[PDB]
Design a protein around this ligand. Structure first.
Ligand code: IHP
Lengths: 69, 69, 186, 313, 49
């Protein structure tokens, strides 16, 4: 029987994450590799890009009517 | 059997202080990696590596003695 | 019997009725029923853990996402946002606002994209600027978004007023950069 | 009609009857024999309800034979009747619950396959359910991913609400993977915060270092501090030393030399210098590097106290 | 005695086979048995005068 099927999927945790030895280094990324907004910003992007494309479309109409005169 | 509670002094570089440090660091890093050049790049320093060199030089530090006894 | 229980008892009890109802329905029901009861459980569960704290913003961000994802009626999604917004951080320090402020941004995004009621969306953005201290700190995020919201609807004469007051109250590098970039694109 | 020594003897006769009919291609008769074999007695159907013929319908061998013929020769709806009745009577083993779901899944009745798994979980008590939950939770994710996530959460919560701590290790990591790739960040971290206390002591360090790595991977070594202090205070003393060495390495590589000492000095009271010599070496190297004459005398003071915690015995 | 021994050798060689396969015999064993077998097993497993 495939008595351990869950282990096939969590392997990326088991290999690199279930154990780690040590570190002795520092850098400006390692001090703060992400910022506390990041997941909230992530989930806005698919909506906020629609606004961005509308902004380029909107600004094109503003220009077009401002040069129509 | 029994163990003391872990008590630690407050960090010298507090979290609010580190926020400022990473703000300056990311800006200074970005404006380096922004741009290179074919001959006039020798005006620039490779700041981030010099900062690493400075940090390992500053890594030796010691508590002062003889303030009392 | 389960539905009669939920219909006639306050939701501070009923946790046993719910868990057993979402056992009964989860076996003997069917998909449209199974998901309906799990949503109503989750809404009740978020509503509880909101009453436990209020400042559990991640409970709001889930709750708002859930109600948006299930296409629930505008008045109820709008109402729950108003309850979210009342949890103003008790601090003058930007660190605590950085998570909070996306309640306002998502509320405006909901009002602009989903409700498509731009007058109401304007009132959301305006109410951001009346709440942020501005003297102690600012979010350039809201000023940029509110400026571009008035570039949409073809009102650059308002967008310039919004963005110029941002420069006026609080010179900040992203505010200058974003206004300059807007004027270049125009 | 005759007597037998026990249920399993009789069940073999019923199977042998359907067996020969199937080999002679009387498939509809073979099913008829199994239907006639499996029919549950009503309370008046026999002279006593504990006779061998009155109990033979509880034999799982008989229902296994019946359901297999329906898969080969029946309709999908008729197979569900057999399996559902087999589940109803407690007859179904966990393995043949998973066969039922495999059958529905193979016929693309995915949502009914989950009801098959669901009542599998209602019948059996841990650890018997463990492979039902394993196959359920991976199939659900492979079927829907994030598209049913709030329902997926309810499975993992329903699993972990009764999971024991010897089995929960894989479920917590599987659950965190869901919340990692689709969920909000603090949810995944809250799973790890649960995992490093819901997993049993013998592997609890392997949950702490996950939580350490994942916080460090996103919020850096500054925000990582408080969950080291939980670890040092909670995991058993051999790993609490190991965490103390790793924590002191961070505070020295940052530069909180005063905090580094208090990590060592707190670990030093559970570290016999007569045997744990590698700990006292790492502290001795630290104090000759970042220390001074005053604090070295304090290291040697505590060293000569903790050895005196044992030599007097 | 023989009948008694048949169950003993059956479970022991199955355990050996399960152990030879590198599988926890107890999980593999519990996979095969009906819920009734569990239920009898779950049943089996100074406040005042
Ligand atoms: O004002 P600046 O020095 O140009 O820095 C800003 C500013 O950072 P702070 O105000 O927190 O110091 C933004 O923050 P908000 O004004 O929008 O609150 C921040 O945006 P986030 O807070 O979302 O990080 C943004 O970063 P980004 O460029 O990634 O949008 C960053 O701008 P610069 O990186 O251009 O300096």
């Amino acid at each position: 029987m495939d008595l351990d099927i869950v282990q096939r999927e969590i392997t990326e945790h088991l290999k690199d994450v279930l154990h780690e030895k040590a570190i002795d280094s520092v850098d400006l990324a390692m001090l703060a590799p992400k910022k506390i907004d990041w997941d909230l910003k992530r989930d806005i992007e698919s909506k906020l890009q629609k606004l961005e494309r509308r902004t380029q479309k909107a600004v094109a109409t503003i220009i077009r009517q401002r040069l129509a005169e | 059997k029994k163990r003391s509670k872990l008590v630690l002094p407050e960090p010298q570089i507090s979290d609010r202080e580190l926020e400022q440090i990473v703000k300056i660091g990311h800006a200074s890093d970005s404006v380096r990696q922004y741009i290179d050049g074919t001959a006039t790049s020798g005006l620039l320093t490779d700041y981030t590596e010099s900062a690493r060199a400075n940090a390992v030089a500053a890594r030796t530090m010691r508590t002062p003695m003889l303030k009392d006894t | 019997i389960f539905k009669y229980g939920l219909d006639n008892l306050p939701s501070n009890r009923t946790e046993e009725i719910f868990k057993h109802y979402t056992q009964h329905e989860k076996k003997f029901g069917e998909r449209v029923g199974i998901e309906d009861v799990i949503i109503s459980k989750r809404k009740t569960q978020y509503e509880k853990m909101v009453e436990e704290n209020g400042y559990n913003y991640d409970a709001w961000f889930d709750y708002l996402r859930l109600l948006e994802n299930e296409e629930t009626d505008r008045e109820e999604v709008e109402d729950v946002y108003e309850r979210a917004i009342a949890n103003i951080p008790p601090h003058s320090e930007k660190r605590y606002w950085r998570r909070y402020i996306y309640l306002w941004i998502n509320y405006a995004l909901y009002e602009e994209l989903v409700a498509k009621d731009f007058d109401r969306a304007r009132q959301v953005y305006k109410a951001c600027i009346d709440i942020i201290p501005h003297k102690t700190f600012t979010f350039a995020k809201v000023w940029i978004m509110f400026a571009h919201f008035e570039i949409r609807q073809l009102d650059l004469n308002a967008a310039r007023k919004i963005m110029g007051v941002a420069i006026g109250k609080c010179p900040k590098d992203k505010l200058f950069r974003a206004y300059i970039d807007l004027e270049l694109q125009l | 009609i005759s007597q037998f020594g026990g249920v399993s003897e009789l069940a073999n006769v019923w199977c042998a009857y359907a067996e020969m009919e199937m080999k002679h291609k009387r498939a509809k008769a073979a099913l008829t024999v199994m239907q006639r074999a499996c029919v549950v007695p009503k309370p008046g159907d026999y002279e006593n309800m504990q006779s061998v013929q009155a109990r033979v319908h509880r034999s799982p061998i008989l229902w296994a034979m019946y359901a297999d013929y329906e898969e080969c020769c029946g309709t999908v709806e008729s197979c569900r009747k057999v399996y559902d009745k087999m589940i109803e009577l407690r007859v179904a083993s966990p393995q043949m619950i998973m066969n039922y779901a495999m059958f529905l899944e193979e016929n693309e009745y995915f949502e009914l396959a989950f009801q098959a798994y669901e009542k599998g979980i209602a019948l059996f008590k841990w650890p018997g359910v463990f492979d039902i939950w394993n196959t359920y939770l991976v199939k659900f994710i492979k079927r829907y991913g994030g598209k049913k996530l709030e329902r997926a959460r309810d499975l993992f919560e329903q699993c972990l609400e009764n999971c024991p701590p010897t089995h929960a290790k894989y479920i917590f990591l599987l659950y965190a993977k869901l919340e990692e790739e689709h969920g909000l960040a603090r949810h995944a971290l809250s799973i790890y915060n649960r995992a490093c206390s819901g997993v049993d002591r013998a592997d609890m360090h392997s949950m702490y270092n996950i939580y350490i790595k994942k916080v460090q991977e996103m919020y850096g070594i500054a925000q990582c501090r408080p969950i080291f202090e939980r670890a040092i205070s909670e995991l058993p003393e051999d790993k609490s030393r190991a965490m103390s060495l790793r924590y002191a390495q961070l505070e020295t590589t940052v530069g909180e030399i005063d905090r580094a000492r208090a990590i060592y000095a707190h670990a030093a009271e559970i570290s016999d210098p007569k045997v744990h010599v590698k700990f006292w070496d790492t502290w001795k190297n630290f104090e000759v590097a970042h220390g001074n004459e005053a604090t070295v005398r304090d290291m040697l003071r505590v060293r000569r106290s903790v050895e005196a915690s044992y030599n007097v015995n | 005695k023989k009948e008694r021994d048949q169950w003993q050798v059956k479970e022991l060689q199955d355990r050996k086979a399960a152990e030879d396969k590198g599988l926890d015999y107890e999980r593999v064993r519990s996979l095969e048995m009906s819920a009734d077998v569990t239920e009898k097993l779950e049943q089996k497993r100074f406040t005042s005068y």
